Structures are given as C-alpha cells and as structure tokens.
Ligand binder design. Structure first.
Ligand SMILES: Cc1cc2nc3c(=O)[nH]c(=O)nc-3n(C[C@H](O)[C@H](O)[C@H](O)COP(=O)(O)OP(=O)(O)OC[C@H]3O[C@@H](n4cnc5c(N)ncnc54)[C@H](O)[C@@H]3O)c2cc1C
Length: 453
C-alpha cells in the first residue's frame, strides 16, 4: 500500500472505536484504496471498520435518473459489504451535521473519506473538520496516480501532463489486494424507503414529453458493481479493437459506456486500465482509449483541484479570455433561452438530436458533447451565460454529470481550457469552431438525427 495515496486532513487523538470510511465518490467494495486503507488502519488498531454514506439534501437538484442509478447500486453494495462482515450506515441530511454526530455517537476512532476536488465536497470537509476531534484522512481512490502527486500545479495542456502521468505509472499502476473481512461483526433507514420518498419528491420535475410519457429510458445502463464489470469485459472483447477508428462516430456504439459507473465510482479506472494493458488489440486503439481514461480523465481532476473557480470565466486561459472579451459585443446569429435549449427547440437539427439523446438516454455521445456545448457559446448572450446553461443541462440530465470530467470538458469547449488558439472568428473568437458541415464530412449526420426524433 503506497502512502502517497493518503493525505491527512486533520490531526487529532485517535479513539478506541471503529474506523469510519465516509464513502462519497467511490461507491464500490472492490478495488477501493480508501476502503482498503480504512481496513488496514482498523486492523492495526484492533478495531473494526465501518462504511457511512450520506444522502445529501442536494439530490433534488438532479433528476430521477441519477437518484435511481446511485441508490440501486448502493443496494447491491450493502449486500457486498455485509458478506465481508462490514456494516454500512446510510445517513440522510447535511454531512457536516450527520458525520460529526455519527462520529460522536459511535465513538469513532479514525475517520477516512475518498478524494474529490469538487466544491461541494470541500464544503462538507470544512463542516466536518470543525466538529470532530479524531484524526481525519482522505484517500485518492479515483485516479491511478494521486491528484496531488501527478502534478503540483495546473497543467495547461495534455502534452504537458502526459509525460508526467506516464512517468509515474510504473509506481502507482499496480494490482489491488483483497479486501480482508472484519474479524467479528461489530455493534439510518432502509434504502428502499429512501428511494421511494426521494422519487416521490422528484416526480413533479421529471422530464416528460407532450404525451405525459417519460423521456428517460433506464434500460440502456444497468447500475451496480456487477453490471459495471460486465460492461468493461464487453468493451474489451467487442469494442476495444474498433475504438481508435470509431470513437468519433456517434452513429456507432463503439464507446466503452463506462462513464456512469466511473462517475459514481461503481468501477475503478485503475482496474479498467489493468485489463486494457494486458489485452491484445490494435495498438492505436489501446493508445486512444488509455489517453482518455488516464490523461483526459485525471487532468479533469487536476483542473478542478488547482482552479478554485473551475466553473467560472476566470479559469479560462488568458488568450481565450482576451479573445472572448474582444467579441462580446458581436451580434449573435441566434439567442435561445434555457428552456429552448432544454427542449431541443433550436434551428440546428443536429444539436436538437444531440439534446434528445441526452434527455432520453442520459449519456450523450462523446463527439456530440463537443458540438452541443460549442453551439451554446455561439447562441448565448455572453460566455458567462453559456457556461451556466452548459453546466445546468450537463449536470441535470447526464448520468455522469456533476463530475470533474464535465466541468473540464465544458471548459475546453467554451473556454478553450487544455486547448490552443485557432482561426479568429466572430462571436466565438479564437475558440475551436465546430461547424455543421464539418460534422457531415465526419459521420452520417442524417442517421444520428433520425435515431433521436
Ligand atoms: C461538453 C462536455 C460534457 C461532458 N460531460 C461529461 C460529464 O458530464 N461527465 C463525464 O464523466 N464526462 C463528460 N464529458 C467527457 C466525455 O464526453 C465523456 O466522458 C464520455 O463521453 C463518456 O462516455 P464513454 O465512457 O462511453 O466514453 P469513452 O470513449 O469509452 O472513454 C472512457 C472514459 O474515458 C474518460 N473520458 C473519455 N473522454 C473524456 C473526456 N473528453 N474528458 C474526460 N474524460 C474522458 C471517461 O472517464 C470515460 O468514461 C464531457 C465532455 C464534454 C466535451
């Protein structure tokens, strides 16, 4: 176990009770460094380990598609942890109040959590730190190389972060040790009831069409740690060989479809990389997929970790801020509202078809995500407005939304973060432009539009 994966958030006197793993980002029992580090500290203290998840008050800011995908995976996890003699406690409310109350009520000895560079997680950490007196650690269980170890600052381009991440791969890319069960079972409601009451509170804001029928189709991605592994094996056996050549074709289902499992932490990215590295396929197809799940995925954590305003105009590069400011007063060709974008009521059928795939499946194709966001910048009153619209629609309807990949992906499309300057156009400036005619020369746009009416 590498000690560089764990960082101390607060020092204190260790209690004599169970080590608490405050689970948040990585909701899985296998290949979890945070859960393994919690079990090792528990073994060294002759004390059991416990898992605590908090059902926050912010679930009403999303939809039913993410609330059901997350809770149905937690129901499977509670069984998996119970087979290892590990009990799971699911608290409802503010984690600044619940975690501090759970630590005091259960005489917690050490508190551990997984790493997340998002603002809402840092908000919880500040509230928990002020109300506990036991040691508090955090473990990077989402990235192969710890986010604070891959780079000590913000990397402005992928070609500057790639040699840093690959030079540390021989050290951190390793096999996971087996989770040891608790020696004996130690000494706040059923998830089925919390799922029922939460869905009932989310029903009025459910996405519906004119016939009062729901838009979301929940049969595209089955939640759970078991279904996540089956998707990973299917991608290696059937889709990995054709990933390098068809990853930019939305009419082909040649992607790994691992993002909803990677976001909620139902599968480990290090586990996927380990199986890809030992799989024999096209070298160009493996290089492209590892560049997305390692470089572009972990550089999104680096962007959110070293830029406090990662969701604001101030985090854009200086060349993009100067270019967008010089084109602020340029007359936009069209200006649509938030609901016009949300309902897919634009003049662009390719954009509307992209929005319909987001509304119906909760996972829009990777290539169309770049077109979908860049057109929001072209048809908004200001770059700040396009950021809010893109973040809203991405975090509301994407199953993998509310993730550092989304903010770093939106920042690349609108603010050119981790990009370079292109030909200067009006309105958009030097930001990389993506035209409708350019997409027709890349893939069958008529097939993608006809599929999502
Ligand atoms: C405007 C926009 C919004 C996005 N919204 C999200 C989002 O809400 N949530 C999210 O997790 N990703 C987002 N992305 C990144 C990317 O679109 C998705 O990760 C990708 O489509 C996920 O589907 P997949 O697993 O089938 O792709 P795959 O090609 O099979 O890639 C596998 C994994 O590599 C990672 N990856 C791939 N592409 C990227 C990328 N461009 N940036 C970072 N990581 C990547 C992902 O973790 C992905 O799961 C967004 C990108 C853009 C441009």
């Amino acid at each position: 176990m590498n000690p560089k994966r764990i960082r101390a958030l607060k020092s204190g006197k260790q209690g004599d009770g169970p080590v608490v793993y405050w689970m948040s980002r990585d909701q899985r029992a296998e290949d979890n460094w945070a859960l393994l580090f919690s079990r090792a500290i528990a073994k060294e203290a002759n004390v059991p380990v416990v898992v605590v998840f908090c059902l926050t008050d912010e679930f009403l800011e999303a939809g039913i598609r993410q609330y059901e995908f997350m809770l149905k995976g937690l129901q499977e996890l509670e069984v998996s942890l119970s087979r290892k003699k590990i009990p799971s406690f699911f608290l409802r409310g503010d984690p600044g109040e619940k975690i501090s109350r759970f630590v005091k009520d259960y005489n917690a000895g050490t508190l551990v959590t997984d790493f997340s560079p998002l603002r809402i997680k840092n908000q919880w950490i500040e509230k928990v730190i002020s109300g506990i007196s036991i040691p508090f650690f955090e473990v990077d269980a989402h990235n192969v190389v710890p986010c604070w170890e891959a780079s000590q600052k913000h990397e402005y381009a992928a070609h500057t972060f790639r040699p840093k991440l690959y030079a540390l791969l021989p050290e951190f890319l390793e096999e996971f040790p087996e989770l040891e069960p608790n020696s004996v079972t130690p000494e706040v409601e059923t998830l089925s009831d919390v799922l029922e009451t939460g869905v009932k509170a989310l029903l009025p804001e459910r996405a519906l069409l004119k016939n009062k029928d729901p838009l979301f189709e929940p049969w595209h991605f089955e939640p759970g740690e078991k279904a996540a592994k089956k998707v990973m094996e299917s991608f290696i056996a059937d889709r990995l060989d054709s990933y390098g050549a068809l990853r930019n074709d939305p009419t082909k289902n040649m992607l790994s479809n691992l993002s909803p499992y990677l976001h909620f932490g139902q599968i480990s990215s290090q586990r996927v990389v380990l199986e890809v590295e030992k799989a024999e396929s096209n070298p160009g197809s493996k290089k492209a997929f590892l560049d997305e799940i390692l470089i572009w995925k972990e550089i999104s954590d680096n962007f959110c970790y070293y830029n406090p305003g990662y969701d604001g105009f101030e985090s854009f590069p200086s060349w993009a801020k100067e270019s967008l400011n010089a084109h602020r007063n340029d007359v936009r060709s069209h200006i649509y509202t938030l609901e016009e974008f949300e309902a897919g009521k634009t003049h662009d059928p390719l954009w509307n078809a992209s929005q319909m795939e987001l509304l119906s499946t909760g996972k829009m194709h990777g290539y169309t995500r770049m077109y979908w966001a860049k057109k929001i910048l072209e048809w908004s009153e200001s770059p700040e407005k396009a950021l809010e619209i893109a973040i809203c629609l991405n975090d509301r309807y994407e199953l993998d939304g509310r993730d550092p990949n989304g903010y770093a992906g939106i920042a690349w499309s609108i603010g050119g973060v981790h990009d370079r300057a292109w030909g200067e156009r009006e309105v958009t400036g030097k930001i990389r432009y993506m035209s409708y005619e350019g997409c027709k020369r890349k893939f069958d746009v008529k097939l993608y539009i006809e599929k999502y009416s």
